[PDB]
Symmetry: D2
Subunit: 255 residues, 4 copies
C-alpha cells in the first residue's frame, strides 16, 4: 500500500513525538489504504552551524521512538550517521534511513542492511537518478530486501535545489520510490508554499510513498522550521494525494 | 477557465502534413468541448543547431498553409516569429504570436508582437529564472498586449540537459497565464526522451497550469525536426483525456495567486 | 597578436567614446604586442526592463564609432540584433559581434558573415563548449574567414553564471577564443572583485584575447555599472595579463 | 608564504607503491625548497560508487605504510577519515587530517579531527556554495583546530559533471587557507578528463591559492582508483615547476583579503 512517512524533523522531546504520533495514529485509522511510518531524527548530525540544535542523543531518541511505537502501534523510521548506530537503532526502527550526504558511505549502508530492517536511502543532492542503481546493489549485497530511494532534490546552482521528476520513473527500475516533500523545497545554507504543489506532482507522476515533516507549531520548530507542515494541515494533504493517485495511477507507466 | 491545448507538428513540413494533423485536432476539439485548441506549427526553424538541418519553406508558404488549416477546420492558430518585421504578416493569420525561448529578452520582437493586437505567448528562456519573467510581461503590457502567456520549457541544467523546476508554474502565474511545453522540456539540447513526456505533463497539470503545449506528428520518426520528442498523432486523444482527468481531480487544491 | 577588446558597454554619447578611445589609443601605443579593438553597443536590445537604457539608435552609434576609428585609428566592434543591421554596421565595424542570446540565430550569423568582416560570437549561457562547433560551421558556410568565440559564462542555477575554463581549450579546436571578463561575473536578473582574478585564470589557461568593458566613472554607467572597469585601472590589468601570458604560454597545450 | 603541494597515490594500493611515489616526492622536496610537500594516500575509499570496486587494505595496514613513508623520507603525511573513531589512530601519523567532500557537514567527524591537535583539511562538498564554508571553519575552530584548510574540488553541474567556480578561491580565503584539488575537479562523477588537469591548475595558481592537491601514480592506467585522473609520476616535476613560475609572476596581483 501507499507509504506515508511523517513526523517532526527532530526529536525535540518525547512529548512532541507523542502529540504528533497521536494525530498520525488518527489518520492511520481514517486511511486504511495507507501505511503510515512515524519519522523523527534522534540527531541532526549535519547542521550548518555548530550552534544549531542537534538533539538529546541516541538513547533518549530511541526511547521516545519506542514510546510512540508502543503507545500507538506505529511503524518507526529514523536516520543513522555512523555504522555503530545501526544495531541499537534497529531495535526500534522498522525502516533505517540513510542521510543524503551519506548515501555513498558503503559501511553505513552495509551496517543498515545487516540489521535485517528495511532501508530508505535519501538520494544525495550530488547524485544522478541512474547513479542510484549502485546504491541499491550495495544494500542487496549487504542482505537488505526492502529498499527505498527517496527523491529530495538536486543541487541547482548555489543555495537552491530542483526536483527533476524524471528521477521517479528512473529509480523505480531498482527500488521503491519515496518523494520527500519537505527537504525538496528547502534552500541549503525554503518555501512552504511549494510543498503541496510539488507533492501533487509526485503522485501524478507516480511514486510508492511520500515523506513529509509535520510539527504542531512549525514556527517554534528547532529544525526545518521554515518547511515543516502544520499538523492540522496533514489530513487534507493526505486525502488530496490519495484522490490524485486514484485517478492518475491509471496512467503510471509499467516498470 | 477553459483549458488551453496548443498542439501541432513542430515544423510546417508541408501544407498536407498540417491538414492531416489539423483534421485530428478538429475531431478532438469536437469531443473535448471544455478545451480551447490552438494549432501550432513553425514556418521557420531559425535556430537549428546545424546549418544542414531543415528550416522550412518560408514565411509566405507557411502563413498560407496555416491559413488553410484555420479556413478548413476553424481552428485558432499560433506560430513563432524570429525578427520584428515578421509580426505584421504573421498576425494576419496567428491568433497567438509565439516568442522563441532564446529571444524572450529581445525587446523589439516582443514590442512588434504586442502592437499587432494578438495574444502573445513567450517561451521562457533556458537562462531565465521564474521571477525574471515579470519584466517580460511588463514589456508586453507596455507594448499593448492584453492576452499574455508564459510557457515553461525547461531550464539549463549542466550541459546538453534541461530540468523542469515546477515551482515556476505558481511563480509565473502571478503575472500571466501559464503554459507547460511537454515536448521541448524533455529534449537534450545539442544531444530527447519521449518516455518522460507523459509523466511530466501529468506533473504540470497536478501542480496547476492554464494549458499545455505538445507537438504531435503522424510519424515522429520521420519528422524533419524534434523527431525524438514529437508525439504520435494517434496518442494525442488519450493524453488529453488524461490531463483533463488529473486537472479535474487536482483542481480543488490549486492555490490562489 | 593578443587581442584586447575594450570600451564602454553602451554608446552613452560619442563624447564618452572619445574619452575612452583616447585612453585605449594611449595603451595601444604603449603595448605594441597587443591588438586593441574598441567596443561599444549602439543598442542594448536585450535589457531586462522596458525602462532601462537602450541607446541612441544605430545611426548615432555608427557615427560615433566612425569618429573613434577616424580620430584614433582604432579597429571597431559592435553587436547586431537583427539581420538587416549587419550591412550598415559593417561600414565601420571590423569585427561584428553576435549577442549571447542570439548565438543560434542562423540568419543573424549568415548576415554577419556575408559582410566579409570578422565575426565574434558570444557563447550562449545555454550552450556547451562542444556545441560551438556548429556555430562556427554556420559562419564558415556563410563565408566568414576570421571567427572568434567568446566565453562569457554559463547558466548556473538561477541568477548566477559560472565560467567553466575547460571551454577555452575545447573551443580553440575550431576558432580563436576570447574571454569576456565583464559579463562572466555579472549576476543575471555581479562582483567587480572577481573580474581581475578570473582574467588571470583565462590567460594562465590560454586564450587568444580578452574582452573587458571600461568606463571613466562606472558608478554613473547607464549599463553594466556594477561590472565596468574604471578607465584608470585598465593599464595595470593589461600589463598583468601580458606578464602572466608571457610565462604561462610556455605551457599552453597544442590545438 | 611557503606553497603547499599535497601529492601521492589516491589509494594505498600497497606499501611498495607508497615508497615508490614517496621517493620521487622526496627528490622533488629537495629541489623545490620553497614548497612544503605533504604525502597523501587514502587507507580506505569508503565512498566508491560500486560495492565491487577497490577500497583498501584497512586502517592498520594503511597507517603503517604511511608511517614508513614518513620514517624513510621525512615527509609530512595526510590521509582522510570516514568515521569519528578513526581520528585518534590516524592522528598518530597524519600531520593533516583530511575530511571527505561528502562528509564536510558531519559535525562529529570534524570535531574528532579538530581535537587531535593536527591540521585539518576539509574537501568542499559538491553541494556547498563558497560562502557556506564559513560555518565549516567555525565548527573546526570550535573544536580546537588551529590550522585549517578548505579544498576546492568542483561543484555539481548537472548530472555526472563538476565545474570549478574559481570565484570560490578568494571567497574561502576569507576564513581559511585554500587548496585546489587538480585531480577530483575534472572527474566525471559516476561517469574524468586528464587533459584538463594542467590547464585548470594553471588557473588556480593565477587566481591565487595556498596550495595544490594532485594525485600521482607510477602507472595511472593500472590505478585501482581514479585511474582516469591520476597524473603519471614522471610528469609531477614539470607541473610543479610550472605552477611555481605562474604563481611567482601572478603573485604581485593577488588581492588582499
Amino acid at each position: 500500500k501507499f507509504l506515508v512517512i511523517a513526523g517532526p524533523n527532530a526529536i525535540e522531546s518525547e512529548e512532541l513525538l507523542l502529540k504528533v504520533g497521536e494525530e498520525i495514529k488518527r489518520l492511520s485509522e481514517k486511511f486504511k489504504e495507507v501505511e503510515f511510518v512515524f519519522k523523527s531524527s534522534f540527531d541532526k548530525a549535519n547542521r550548518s552551524s555548530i550552534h544549531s540544535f542537534r538533539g538529546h542523543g541516541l538513547e533518549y531518541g530511541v526511547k521516545a521512538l519506542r514510546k510512540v511505537k508502543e503507545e500507538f502501534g506505529l511503524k518507526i523510521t529514523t536516520d543513522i550517521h555512523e555504522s555503530w548506530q545501526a544495531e541499537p537503532v534497529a531495535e526500534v526502527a522498522d525502516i533505517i534511513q540513510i542521510p543524503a550526504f551519506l548515501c555513498r558511505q558503503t559501511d553505513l549502508l552495509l551496517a543498515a542492511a545487516k540489521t535485517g530492517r528495511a532501508v530508505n536511502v535519501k538520494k544525495g543532492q550530488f547524485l544522478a537518478p541512474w547513479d542510484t542503481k549502485n546504491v541499491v546493489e550495495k544494500l542487496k549485497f549487504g542482505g537488505a530486501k526492502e529498499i527505498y530511494l527517496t527523491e529530495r532534490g538536486t543541487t541547482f546552482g548555489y543555495n537552491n535545489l530542483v526536483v527533476d521528476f524524471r528521477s521517479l520513473p528512473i529509480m523505480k527500475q531498482w527500488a521503491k520510490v519515496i518523494y520527500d516533500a519537505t527537504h525538496s523545497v528547502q534552500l541549503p545554507g525554503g518555501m512552504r508554499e511549494f510543498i503541496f504543489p510539488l507533492i501533487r506532482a509526485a503522485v501524478a507522476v507516480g511514486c510508492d510513498g511520500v515523506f513529509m515533516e509535520t510539527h504542531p507549531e512549525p514556527e517554534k520548530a528547532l529544525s526545518d522550521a521554515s518547511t515543516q507542515l502544520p499538523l492540522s494541515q496533514l489530513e487534507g494533504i493526505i486525502e488530496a494525494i490519495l484522490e490524485i493517485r486514484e485517478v492518475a495511477s491509471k496512467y503510471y507507466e509499467t516498470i
